[PDB]
Write a protein that binds this ligand. Sequence first.
Ligand code: HEM
Ligand SMILES: c1ccc2[nH]cnc2c1
Length: 291
Amino acid sequence: LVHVASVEKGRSYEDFQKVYNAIALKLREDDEYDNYIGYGPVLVRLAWHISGTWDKHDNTGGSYGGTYRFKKEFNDPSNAGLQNGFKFLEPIHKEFPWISSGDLFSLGGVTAVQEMQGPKIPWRCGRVDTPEDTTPDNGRLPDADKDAGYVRTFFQRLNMNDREVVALMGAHALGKTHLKNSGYEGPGGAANNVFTNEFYLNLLNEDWKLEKNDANNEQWDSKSGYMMLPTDYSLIQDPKYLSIVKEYANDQDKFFKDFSKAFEKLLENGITFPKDAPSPFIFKTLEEQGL
Ligand code: HEM
Ligand SMILES: c1ccc2[nH]cnc2c1
């Protein structure tokens, strides 16, 4: 399976910076969603789930085809709650009918991270929508009730190494788990929407307690109101993972640079870019534009 990137006809950087600004401006406007967390967290979760279906062995899945618009993927139990991100983007797609689905879902992810003051993420255009029979089957996304060995083996399918996996998991500093979507609950009081290296600092400094929640699932809870999934807590149980957790807890600039590389790689897996293709775009934030 080869997927060649194809620039939307006649478009250039100025066109995609307008779509970036439309997403960022609506993120500012609809600030009340999910008890004032806003839509930033669910949009980086959507971009990860539409990319996280990729399989390096036969190049099926991934962000290229925009197949989340089809029923089988939209109704995957693992994607419960992401309908809210899709409904957020649906007016922006109406406004810019020329951008492909895969490009709009991955650009929503990039825009959310930068507007929540995370690192710049270089982004490349050219994903092309493919037919409903190219939709991957359900069951390619990870379970949350497992250990370090499972996380490592799972991420090898997307060929992510240990360092890339620990950098990517730092996004669980954002937003919250919801009992009706996944069977995990919390945080609430201090759930957030600013991108920082706080997930690593919390993992190493909080006093964690293994408790059972209202859906009868176990999770790690702290006195301060924070929570961790079994798969999050895994990162301090494994010796390789723990030494990288300690490095990002002690250097937020190294965490930003490594997250940026790994998130762009996640969004680009499975796509072949021609050498006459444009360079990656670095979009300005609303703040850098004075908007
Ligand atoms: C083994 C890996 C992972 C597992 C098992 C996992 C699992 C989960 C679960 C169970 C939720 C809660 C969903 C809900 O109830 O609403 C969640 C939320 C979230 N995840 Fe992950 N995740 C993984 C990796 C990642 C990665 C790699 C990213 C991003 C690069 C990410 C970003 C997010 C974000 C931002 C949320 C919050 C969504 C919201 O606030 O609505 N996750 N994760
Ligand atoms: C999603 C959101 C917040 C989290 N804190 C720990 N794991 C999480 C997953």
